[PDB]
Amino acid sequence: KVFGRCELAAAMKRHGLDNYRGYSLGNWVCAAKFESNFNTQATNRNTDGSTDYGILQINSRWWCNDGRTPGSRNLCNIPCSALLSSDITASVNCAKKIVSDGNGMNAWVAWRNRCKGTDVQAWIRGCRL
Ligand SMILES: [Cl-]
Ligand SMILES: [Cl-]
Ligand SMILES: [Cl-]
Ligand SMILES: [Cl-]
Ligand SMILES: [Cl-]
Ligand SMILES: [Cl-]
Ligand SMILES: [Cl-]
Ligand SMILES: [Cl-]
Ligand SMILES: [Cl-]
Ligand SMILES: [Cl-]
Ligand SMILES: [Cl-]
Ligand SMILES: [Cl-]
Ligand SMILES: [N+]
Ligand SMILES: [N+]
Ligand code: NA
Ligand code: NA
Ligand code: NA
Ligand code: NA
Ligand code: NA
Structure with missing residues (x-):
């Protein structure tokens, strides 16, 4: 599924991501924009042989099982495929674990490089939330 911007914002809020670990909703929407362009089916192979899955490009090195990341x-505790669903529950639950791991949203290199420090509220501006 390719979410609309406000649609994804709403789904993230529904699932308790808004202000989770102090990260406003726009931070999460911005991260999803640059990780996946809001596409739940996004996958990307990393140099190390791991793969990133879903709207938040969650990596198989640590977070999910794909059977091919030595x-x-x-x-x-999920198959990586669960991260590709149109329902974002598994991605959100896993993201909550990731952002609690010590480095906050810096876990997402694209967040650090493209969202951190920016006017992230632009990503939710106008949305009925
Ligand atoms: Cl929108
Ligand atoms: Cl957009
Ligand atoms: Cl925001
Ligand atoms: Cl794996
Ligand atoms: Cl594996
Ligand atoms: Cl393969
Ligand atoms: Cl393996
Ligand atoms: Cl494990
Ligand atoms: Cl599995
Ligand atoms: Cl959803
Ligand atoms: Cl933090
Ligand atoms: Cl950018
Ligand atoms: N919020
Ligand atoms: N990785
Ligand atoms: Na699609
Ligand atoms: Na992999
Ligand atoms: Na894994
Ligand atoms: Na794969
Ligand atoms: Na999911």
Whole structure:
């Protein structure tokens, strides 16, 4: 599924991501924009052989099982495919774990490089939330 911007904002809020660990909703929408362009089915292979899955490009090195990332963990206790669903529940639950791991949203390199410090409220501006 390719979400609309306000549609994704609403779904993220529904699932308790808004202000989670102090990160406003626009931070999360911005991260999703640059990780996946709001496409739940996005996948990307990393140099290390891990793969990133879903709207927040959650990595199989630590967070999910895909059966083909040697030496990896599955700390969200989910198949990586669950992260591609039109329903964002599994991505949101796993993101909450990731952002609580110590480095906040810096876990998402694209957030650090493209969202951090910017006017992230623009990503939710206009939305009925
Ligand atoms: Cl929109
Ligand atoms: Cl957009
Ligand atoms: Cl915001
Ligand atoms: Cl894996
Ligand atoms: Cl694996
Ligand atoms: Cl393969
Ligand atoms: Cl493996
Ligand atoms: Cl594990
Ligand atoms: Cl699995
Ligand atoms: Cl959803
Ligand atoms: Cl933080
Ligand atoms: Cl940018
Ligand atoms: N919010
Ligand atoms: N990785
Ligand atoms: Na689509
Ligand atoms: Na992989
Ligand atoms: Na894994
Ligand atoms: Na894969
Ligand atoms: Na999901």
